[PDB]
């Protein structure tokens, strides 16, 4: 398995995902429109942050990354657009880190840039929280690139895999830098306990694992739950896919027990990510110029 | 209902499991009589503004879990160790207190005082934030619809809640200064450490504290997800929880040797304390 694929299922599963969201979430996500200059403010900061790492990346590639933030926040409830712009920058620059050959990982060079982004957009205390989460994320991505721990958690069972993904997919980082956008106390506390990350991990990870399976197997990347099944076996795939859909539904139904603003945010993240993932260049083909490995 | 009809068998089954999968037994940390008094003085000073007194016996009951569940082979900082002793004991008191007794204005400063006494500046912020998050979570979720949904839906929703609520995430973020081991610090700060150890800690505590919490109408206990009266269903459910512990423990063994030691000493350590301590023999 290195040239295995979920291509045959692409159509049916997208419809299965879509019908699950129509039944259980209902409310469609709405894309944040960035003005002319906000978009270039963001992209300018993004280049500045990765510039020390010595790899050019395109405005096309930036706008691929930033799409998840434009689509998966909660525009009904946004209050702080400076915090929003920060999440755009931080998520974009850590995507680059994610897509990057570990030889290009310079902490001494990159970590000061993360701190600068945070101090620019947040107040003193939010900046510290956003930075520790940024630091932990890029440190975790680097730590596990060939770790035996990653192999154990990703090959043992769904539970061990999703436990790894709370940090690795970046959703704990996302909550801890997104709470200042909303200035909602309940959500802020769920972000700080990581309950918010834990509630949304499977919904984000299952969707992303399906649509990025082809790219990741081609690159030898083993962090994908559908590697726990034989995708060439249609019966095994469909049974596994079904249990992953049950996981998403159970999570969503428990999310509805949270207060109204908080659950709106959780569901806009799960559903928004699905709209971005299924409409974006990054998940259209295994290898292209917005998702190719950034190497030596 | 009660799980006393099962206590004898399940204790042996727990032990058999640890003997096979962990083997290395926990050992109790001995404090000098000076150290014990410093801890108890710090504990009494932190709870005093809340207006409740705590017997010296009940403090030593609480501190048992820290004496037994650290990894004495790897300790490099006894000031950090006494911090955990103090922080664990005082947050125990907060756990057992009626929500009306909860006052953040008075208690949060005492937590920060403790962390500032025993830790460097960076560690003190990490320990204090985790202490704040724990007591704020325990308060927030008393009679919360969220807690009811997460504890009555499935084991998976339940254990997700317990990562924070049982206090293991707090434990790791206040305990990594004890060891100054760079890998363990990172797993502690990602909360991977807490996630790896949540079920081993929670399943044990849930079994032995089931009787108390059912009497007090507390729902945060996984054995309320099965019918403890039906002994077939109980044995089935208890086996699945045992399988949960075994899988976690085998995956923990892929962590580095020192980190793996701390994780397993934590889970096994808590089982010995729980089974022997005053806290868990009557409601
Ligand atoms: Mg990744
Ligand atoms: Mg990736
Ligand atoms: Mg992926
Ligand atoms: Mg309790
Ligand atoms: Mg409790
Ligand atoms: Mg208990």
Curated annotation (Swiss-Prot), chain B:
Motif (DDXXD motif): 95-98
UniProt keyword Metal-binding, yes or no: yes
Keyword Transport among UniProt keywords: no
Substitution effect: residue 98 to E: No change in product (cyclooctat-9-en-7-ol)
Binding site for Mg(2+) 1: 95
Sorted UniProt keywords: Isomerase, Lyase, Magnesium, Metal-binding
Positions bound to Mg(2+) 2: 95
SS bond partners: none
Entry EC number(s): 4.2.3.146
Textual note on the cofactor: Binds 3 Mg(2+) ions per subunit.
InterPro entries, sorted: Isoprenoid_synthase_dom_sf
Binding positions for Mg(2+) 3 per the UniProt entry: 205, 209, 213
Membrane-crossing segments per the record: none
Motif NSE/DTE motif: where in chain: 205-213
Cofactor: Mg(2+)
Domain of life of the source: Bacteria
GO MF assignments: isomerase activity; lyase activity; metal ion binding
Pfam family, one: Terpene_syn_C_2
Effect of residue 273 to G: Produces 3,7,18-dolabellatriene
Enzymatic reactions: geranylgeranyl diphosphate + H2O = cyclooctat-9-en-7-ol + diphosphate
Family: Belongs to the terpene synthase family.
Complexes and interactors: Homodimer.
Role, per record: Catalyzes the cyclization of the linear isoprenoid intermediate geranylgeranyl diphosphate to tricycclic cyclooctat-9-en-7-ol in the cyclooctatin biosynthesis pathway. Cyclooctatin is a potent inhibitor of lysophospholipase.
Domain topic, free-text comment: The Asp-Asp-Xaa-Xaa-Asp/Glu(DDXXD/E) motifs is important for the catalytic activity, presumably through binding to Mg(2+).
Other facts noted in the record for this chain: 3,7,18-dolabellatriene produced by the Trp288Gly mutant has potential antibiotic activity against multidrug-resistant S.aureus (MRSA).
Protein name (record): Cyclooctat-9-en-7-ol synthase
UniProt source species: Streptomyces melanosporofaciens
Underlying gene: CotB2
């Amino acid at each position: 398995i290195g040239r295995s694929s979920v291509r045959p299922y692409l159509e049916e599963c997208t419809r299965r995902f879509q019908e699950m969201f129509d039944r259980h979430v209902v409310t469609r996500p709405t894309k944040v429109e960035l003005t002319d200059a906000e978009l270039r403010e963001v992209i300018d900061d993004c280049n500045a942050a990765v510039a020390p790492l010595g790899k050019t990346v395109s405005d096309e590639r930036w706008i691929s990354y930033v799409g998840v933030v434009l689509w998966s926040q909660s525009p009904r409830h946004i209050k702080d657009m400076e915090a929003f712009k920060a999440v755009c920058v931080l998520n974009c620059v850590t995507f680059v880190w994610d897509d990057m050959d570990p030889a290009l990982h310079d902490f001494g060079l990159f970590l000061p840039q993360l701190r600068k982004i945070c101090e620019k957009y947040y107040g003193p205390e939010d900046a510290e929280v956003a930075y520790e989460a940024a630091r932990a994320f890029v440190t975790s991505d680097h730590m596990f690139r060939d770790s035996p721990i990653k192999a154990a958690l990703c090959t043992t069972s769904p539970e061990q895999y999703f436990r790894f993904r709370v940090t690795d997919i970046g959703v704990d980082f996302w909550m801890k830098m997104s709470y200042p956008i909303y200035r909602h106390p309940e959500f802020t506390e769920h972000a700080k306990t990581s309950l918010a990350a834990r509630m949304t991990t499977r919904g984000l990870t299952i969707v992303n694992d399906f649509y990025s399976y082809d790219r990741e197997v081609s690159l030898g990347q083993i962090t994908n739950c559908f590697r726990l099944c034989d995708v060439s076996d249609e019966t095994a795939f469909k049974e596994f896919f079904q249990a992953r859909l049950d996981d998403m539904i159970e999570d969503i139904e428990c999310i509805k027990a949270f207060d109204q603003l908080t659950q709106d945010v959780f569901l806009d993240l799960i559903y928004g990510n699905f709209v971005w993932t299924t409409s974006n260049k990054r998940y259209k083909t295994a290898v292209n110029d917005v998702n190719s490995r950034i190497q030596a």
